[PDB]
């Protein structure tokens, strides 16, 4: 289920010829890789220890790339302009995601292309790798005129080659980093809510990676529709945060039960107040 | 290692 | 037009222990445009210093962004974060519970 992805991100700034460009590539939804227009020296650069394995001619090369990047986006943003008829005194934002996905058996399991303007699909590559699914009006222009052009082989070639080579190579470079996990440390609060009931709240904390399931139980049953779940969030270090919590009568906590899935645990925890 | 695009734009 | 109001989230790094040095973090998440200006405050007063991560989007396009900064959690101090953006009339002012 490993995968690697390269979100990008342009920015029109109104009355200036140049959008911000900024572009961020993940491994296992680490960013390991980003790239900023608004820098005083635009480049890409590491976000991860592992990549500092890299030489100066790769990342002379990424930048290269970005400032091809940067061209693309700001001719698509003005085309973008037209087909929309919007006026270019405003800000816009055009989107791209891209990258491949390995399979249990680590061949290639899927190849990924996606574009979205003011933060809405656009057009995107279909899993054959061949076929277009526009989203709207305007978008089915860009895919008749990328039919016409034989963009989609273009696609096609990088995410099953390309991808694939560095994507084993990043995870090779980063294995004890990217495999590692941080169990949660877990426990349950209790809290005044109203009158005859309280509230417990179980937490999940400093774990990595970010995936994780947390459940409430009343007597053998999960409490699927009467549990508040948090967004997991970072904890700023690296790792994550989670908690769920449910309203019960005052005098039988004890009843409820929270069990914390996350794979750095071989078991599950069981915790209450 | 990052993506070029198509020549082709939007 | 396409807008996406931000969702918001103001916790410690660390368990909260009144009197111990810890980290509070303003997780702004879900919003669009992605131009937005975040303050995190101590008793209603600016806090200097205080460290924005990149921005970034999500799977659904929406973007996030992590601002954080050195505190002290105590007894009487309020903590806060507010956040200004397009999708919002006025600033969106978020208090930091420590239950939360």
């Given at each position: 289920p490993h995968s690697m992805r390269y979100f990008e991100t342009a920015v029109s700034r109104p009355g200036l010829e140049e959008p911000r460009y900024i572009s961020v590539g993940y491994v296992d939804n680490?960013?390991?890789?980003?790239?900023?227009?608004?820098?005083?020296?635009?480049?890409?650069?590491?976000?991860?220890?592992?990549?500092?394995?890299?030489?100066?001619?790769?990342?002379?090369?990424?930048?290269?790339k970005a400032k091809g990047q940067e061209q693309w986006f700001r001719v698509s943003?003005?085309?973008?302009?037209?087909?929309?008829?919007?006026?270019?005194?405003?800000?816009?934002?055009?989107?791209?995601?891209?990258?491949?996905?390995?399979?249990?058996?680590?061949?290639?399991?899927?190849?990924?292309?996606?574009?979205?303007?003011?933060?809405?699909?656009?057009?995107?590559?279909?899993?054959?790798?061949?076929?277009?699914?526009?989203?709207?009006?305007?978008?089915?222009?860009?895919?008749?005129?990328?039919?016409?052009?034989?963009?989609?082989?273009?696609?096609?070639?990088?995410?099953?080659?390309?991808?694939?080579?560095?994507?084993?190579?990043?995870?090779?470079?980063?294995?004890?980093?990217?495999?590692?996990?941080?169990?949660?440390?877990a426990h349950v609060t209790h809290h005044p809510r109203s009158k005859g009931e309280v509230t417990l709240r179980c937490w999940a904390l400093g774990f990595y990676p970010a995936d994780i399931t947390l459940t409430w139980q009343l007597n053998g049953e999960e409490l699927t529709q009467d549990m508040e779940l948090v967004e997991t969030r970072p904890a700023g270090d690296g790792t994550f945060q989670k908690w769920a919590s449910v309203v019960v009568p005052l005098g039988k906590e004890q009843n409820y039960t929270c069990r914390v899935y996350h794979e750095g645990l071989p078991e599950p925890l069981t915790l209450r107040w | 290692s990052s993506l070029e695009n198509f020549a082709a734009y939007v | 037009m396409i807008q996406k109001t931000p969702q918001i989230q103001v916790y410690s790094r660390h368990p909260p222990e009144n009197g111990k040095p810890n980290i509070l973090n303003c997780y702004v998440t879900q919003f669009h445009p992605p131009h937005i200006e975040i303050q995190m405050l101590k008793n209603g007063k600016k806090i200097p210093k205080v460290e924005m991560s990149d921005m970034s989007f999500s799977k659904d396009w929406s973007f996030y962004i992590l601002a954080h900064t050195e505190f002290t959690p105590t007894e009487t101090d309020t903590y806060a974060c507010r956040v200004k953006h397009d999708s919002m009339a006025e600033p969106k002012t978020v208090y930091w519970d420590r239950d939360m």
């Open positions: 680490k960013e390991f890789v980003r790239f900023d227009s608004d820098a005083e020296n635009p480049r890409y650069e590491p976000r991860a220890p592992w990549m500092e394995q890299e030489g100066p001619e790769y990342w002379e090369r990424e930048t290269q943003l003005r085309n973008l302009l037209g087909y929309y008829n919007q006026s270019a005194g405003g800000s816009h934002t055009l989107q791209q995601m891209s990258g491949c996905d390995l399979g249990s058996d680590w061949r290639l399991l899927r190849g990924y292309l996606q574009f979205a303007y003011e933060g809405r699909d656009y057009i995107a590559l279909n899993e054959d790798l061949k076929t277009w699914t526009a989203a709207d009006m305007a978008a089915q222009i860009t895919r008749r005129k990328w039919e016409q052009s034989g963009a989609a082989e273009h696609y096609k070639a990088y995410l099953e080659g390309e991808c694939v080579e560095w994507l084993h190579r990043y995870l090779k470079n980063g294995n004890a980093t990217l495999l590692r996990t941080d169990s949660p440390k | - | -």
